[PDB]
Design an enzyme around this catalytic site. Sequence first.
Site, PDB file in Angstrom:
ATOM      1  CG  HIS A  42     -19.181 -25.735 -19.931  1.00 37.84           C
ATOM      2  ND1 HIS A  42     -20.157 -26.203 -20.975  1.00 37.84           N
ATOM      3  CD2 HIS A  42     -18.721 -24.478 -20.142  1.00 37.84           C
ATOM      4  CE1 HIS A  42     -20.511 -24.931 -21.397  1.00 37.84           C
ATOM      5  NE2 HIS A  42     -19.781 -24.074 -21.000  1.00 37.84           N
ATOM      6  CG  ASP A  88     -21.486 -29.476 -21.030  1.00 33.90           C
ATOM      7  OD1 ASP A  88     -21.285 -29.218 -19.815  1.00 33.90           O
ATOM      8  OD2 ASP A  88     -21.021 -28.507 -21.893  1.00 33.90           O
ATOM      9  CB  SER A 185     -22.259 -22.217 -22.440  1.00 34.40           C
ATOM     10  OG  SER A 185     -21.270 -21.565 -23.131  1.00 34.40           O
ATOM     11  N   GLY A 186     -24.993 -23.430 -21.566  1.00 36.75           N
ATOM     12  CA  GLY A 186     -25.934 -23.952 -20.505  1.00 36.75           C
ATOM     13  C   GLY A 186     -27.269 -23.581 -20.945  1.00 36.75           C
TER      14      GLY A 186
HETATM   15  C1  LIG Z   1     -13.703 -30.569 -26.821  1.00 35.30           C
HETATM   16  N1  LIG Z   1     -13.737 -29.203 -26.425  1.00 35.30           N
HETATM   17  C2  LIG Z   1     -14.717 -28.926 -25.482  1.00 35.30           C
HETATM   18  C3  LIG Z   1     -14.729 -27.442 -25.098  1.00 35.30           C
HETATM   19  C4  LIG Z   1     -14.333 -26.515 -26.161  1.00 35.30           C
HETATM   20  N2  LIG Z   1     -14.286 -25.050 -26.167  1.00 35.30           N
HETATM   21  C5  LIG Z   1     -13.910 -24.669 -27.319  1.00 35.30           C
HETATM   22  C6  LIG Z   1     -13.856 -23.108 -27.689  1.00 35.30           C
HETATM   23  O1  LIG Z   1     -13.459 -22.811 -28.773  1.00 35.30           O
HETATM   24  N3  LIG Z   1     -14.283 -22.203 -26.798  1.00 35.30           N
HETATM   25  C7  LIG Z   1     -14.396 -20.627 -26.719  1.00 35.30           C
HETATM   26  C8  LIG Z   1     -13.039 -20.154 -26.453  1.00 35.30           C
HETATM   27  C9  LIG Z   1     -12.841 -19.933 -24.833  1.00 35.30           C
HETATM   28  C10 LIG Z   1     -13.678 -20.537 -23.891  1.00 35.30           C
HETATM   29  C11 LIG Z   1     -15.106 -20.394 -24.424  1.00 35.30           C
HETATM   30  C12 LIG Z   1     -15.522 -20.110 -25.688  1.00 35.30           C
HETATM   31  N4  LIG Z   1     -16.769 -20.431 -26.436  1.00 35.30           N
HETATM   32  C13 LIG Z   1     -17.402 -20.208 -27.452  1.00 35.30           C
HETATM   33  O2  LIG Z   1     -16.897 -19.412 -28.162  1.00 35.30           O
HETATM   34  C14 LIG Z   1     -18.500 -20.999 -27.885  1.00 35.30           C
HETATM   35  C15 LIG Z   1     -19.300 -21.896 -27.249  1.00 35.30           C
HETATM   36  C16 LIG Z   1     -20.289 -22.096 -28.301  1.00 35.30           C
HETATM   37  C17 LIG Z   1     -21.464 -22.946 -28.149  1.00 35.30           C
HETATM   38  C18 LIG Z   1     -22.323 -22.884 -29.277  1.00 35.30           C
HETATM   39 CL1  LIG Z   1     -23.775 -24.027 -29.358  1.00 35.30          CL
HETATM   40  C19 LIG Z   1     -22.017 -22.292 -30.381  1.00 35.30           C
HETATM   41  C20 LIG Z   1     -20.968 -21.405 -30.557  1.00 35.30           C
HETATM   42  C21 LIG Z   1     -19.992 -21.294 -29.379  1.00 35.30           C
HETATM   43  N5  LIG Z   1     -18.967 -20.652 -29.275  1.00 35.30           N
HETATM   44  S1  LIG Z   1     -13.531 -25.891 -28.486  1.00 35.30           S
HETATM   45  C22 LIG Z   1     -13.944 -27.081 -27.516  1.00 35.30           C
HETATM   46  C23 LIG Z   1     -13.691 -28.300 -27.759  1.00 35.30           C
END
Ligand SMILES: CN1CCc2nc(C(=O)N[C@@H]3CCCC[C@@H]3NC(=O)c3cc4cc(Cl)ccc4[nH]3)sc2C1
Lengths: 233, 54
Positions: A42, A88, A185-186
């Site tokens: 991703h 991923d 992430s990553g």
């Molecule tokens: C099946 N889907 C895949 C991707 C996804 N991103 C989601 C999400 O809430 N993403 C956030 C909103 C905007 C894009 C990036 C944001 N990422 C995060 O806040 C996030 C990633 C992550 C990873 C980990 Cl390990 C802990 C906390 C955490 N918070 S919910 C979801 C479910």
Amino acid sequence: IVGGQECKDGECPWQALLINEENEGFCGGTILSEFYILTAAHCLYQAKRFKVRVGDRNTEQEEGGEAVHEVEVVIKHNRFTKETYDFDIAVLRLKTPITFRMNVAPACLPERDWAESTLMTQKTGIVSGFGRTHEKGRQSTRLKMLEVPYVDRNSCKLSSSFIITQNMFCAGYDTKQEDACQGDSGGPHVTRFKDTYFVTGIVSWGEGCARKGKYGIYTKVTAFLKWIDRSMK
Amino acid sequence: TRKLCSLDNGDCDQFCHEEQNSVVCSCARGYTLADNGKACIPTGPYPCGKQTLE
Ligand SMILES: CN1CCc2nc(C(=O)N[C@@H]3CCCC[C@@H]3NC(=O)c3cc4cc(Cl)ccc4[nH]3)sc2C1
Ligand SMILES: [Ca+2]
Ligand SMILES: [Ca+2]
């Protein structure tokens, strides 16, 4: 990372940072060898062109140790899917080899069965990154680490709005305000065993950061060891 | 009843595998198994998996 602590000198040396054209960090990565970085697939849609920074702990100031490396080959998993974030995982092969030194060194890859049996049955592992310090916050300028407990697989599925596949696992806290977050992430999830650190996961996604009754979702590295071995050739 | 690899990792420093009914230890890449067949010894500088001292 929301909560947790700074990585102090020499504590998180397998941490990599994927940086964009504007030269700012957008995703983490893990150093596997002098040529190969592990990251989330991703992350590969989060910039048109990117480089890999290593040895960085404080992104505001240059303590001589950092180096940027260009990417020669991206190997995304054939089955990654944006929709569920299943598969991923990507491997990057660097044009030039990482020179190991203070703050720059690889994490070990474990053996599948040993890892499932021994590492993922420990209490905690360690995740690290330069991502957000709170859901709505800015990226950290200091590299941070956080110990996160492995979570029961059933509890995790109950907790999640989304499908948790066999390629994922949960770690984190139910109510304590500590978590990985966007920008981490990553990045690595490593498990310590007797003084040695092993990669066990890749920071993938969560539903915001540190929310009550929610956990972090990690790619299960042990499901991909053969694949990584193949990618490295 | 915890036997072999299930009892304190079979005395192994890293990987443990039950082969026949004995424990066989081995080591991540960049280590070698010591003479005692249990401990793992780094064969270069900057072995994987260690926090750096210099
Ligand atoms: C099946 N889907 C895949 C991707 C996804 N991103 C989601 C999400 O809430 N993403 C956030 C909103 C905007 C894009 C990036 C944001 N990422 C995060 O806040 C996030 C990633 C992550 C990873 C980990 Cl390990 C802990 C906390 C955490 N918070 S919910 C979801 C479910
Ligand atoms: Ca710096
Ligand atoms: Ca939580």
